[PDB]
Amino acid sequence: MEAVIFDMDGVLMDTEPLYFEAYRRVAESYGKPYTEDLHRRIMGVPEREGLPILMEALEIKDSLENFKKRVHEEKKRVFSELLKENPGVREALEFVKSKRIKLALATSTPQREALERLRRLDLEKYFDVMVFGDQVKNGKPDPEIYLLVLERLNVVPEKVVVFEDSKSGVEAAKSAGIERIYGVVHSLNDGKALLEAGAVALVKPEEILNVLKEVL
User: Fold this and answer.
1) Which one is catalytic: 7, 9, 122, 142?
2) Which residues participate directly in catalysis?
3) How far is CA 41 from CA 21, 46, 53, 152, 213, in A?
4) Whole-angstrom Cα distance, residue 193 to residue 202?
5) Is 165 one of the annotated active-site residues of the chain?
């Protein structure tokens, strides 16, 4: 194998579970309550259209610009306080480096934002190549992002392993010609959609290390 490629969010660390607390703090800053029942529904749509809905749902009287800024502030605080690396992922990154194999990161998250997170978690130092969502024209499921990772690594897709956590991520890597895609899951029985998109197996973050020991 010549390289191992990781998605960031949902593999190296998980931000999705902290969204409730971030949005709860926003509501609280305006003297408003917030429920998981509303939040579960708010999360079924992109944040761009989700935020304005949240503001009106909560009967908040502010400009959207001011609201978005508060959301920005509360996410920083929450992530800074509570975002931690997933168990076993550091050992997995250390293992790839121990084999003198190249290590790459691919994420839909824009560069500046993504680097802040990785730096706080001290995971940035492992990677040889990192590609971010603002570095391609069309994002997942378009294969552009994985094609650029392959380009920057200067490796053929049949010699890389990818750890992905979304349907669109798996589709993108597969469309780029990469076959060895593992779907990273977080709960009792999620992951069917990743397998249907072409993942060759499901793994928890803690199981990634043993996968690498098997395939590298």
Assistant:
1) 7
2) 7
3) 15, 11, 11, 39, 40
4) 10
5) no
